[PDB]
């Protein structure tokens with residue numbers, strides 16, 4: 001049994017809490033969604049063993065700049081989240097999230113996670129988005145940002161449809177465990 005700590009950050013409303021509730025329960029939140037989900041644990045097969053991943057939600061607004069980082073000590077991997085239908089939230093992964101995580105946790109790997117993939121793929125939503133002169137974040141743009149912030153992985157997912165949802169957390173686990181292997185004596 002190995003334990004890892006995963007903290008989820010990103011702009012308000014990109015879907016951090018829904019991501020965590022969907023992973024915890026297997027269902028997109030059916031009732032009231034809290035601002036910040038209480039931290040919880042999940043046991044996941046990994047190699048010949050079991051990883052216990054402890055998941056921490058955060059309040060992403062700038063108002064919480066001093067309270068939110070109190071969650072950061074001893075983190076093994078961060079999920080930096082942006083909505084695939086909000087290009088502004090992608091740019092903030094560079095101007096805000098990468099800078100904050102480098103300041104507090106310079107050695108901790110990051111996974112860049114695109115959320116709300118179902119809306120990116122929803123033809124009617126895309127039309128209405130286009131009426132406001134916005135288009136979805138492309139995978140080309142998301143991968144470019146992955147490199148810009150030196151994230152160890154990138155994935156696009158939907159808490160609503162579960163598309164790539166559990167694999168986003170499998171990606172975070174694999175990155176954390178491989179870093180732990182790299183840091184061990186030979």
Ligand SMILES: Nc1nc2c(ncn2[C@@H]2O[C@H](COP(=O)(O)OP(=O)(O)O)[C@@H](O)[C@H]2O)c(=O)[nH]1
Pocket residue numbers: 010011012013014015016017018019033034035060115116117118119157158159160161
């Ligand atoms: N269509 C869709 N909506 C989502 C998804 N994830 C979150 N939402 C919606 O986005 C809004 C904000 O979600 P929330 O989890 O509170 O975002 P947070 O502020 O980052 O924690 C809510 O209306 C959610 O229902 C998703 O994968 N697909």
Ligand SMILES: [Mg+2]
Pocket residue numbers: 016017018034035036037057058
């Ligand atoms: Mg939330």
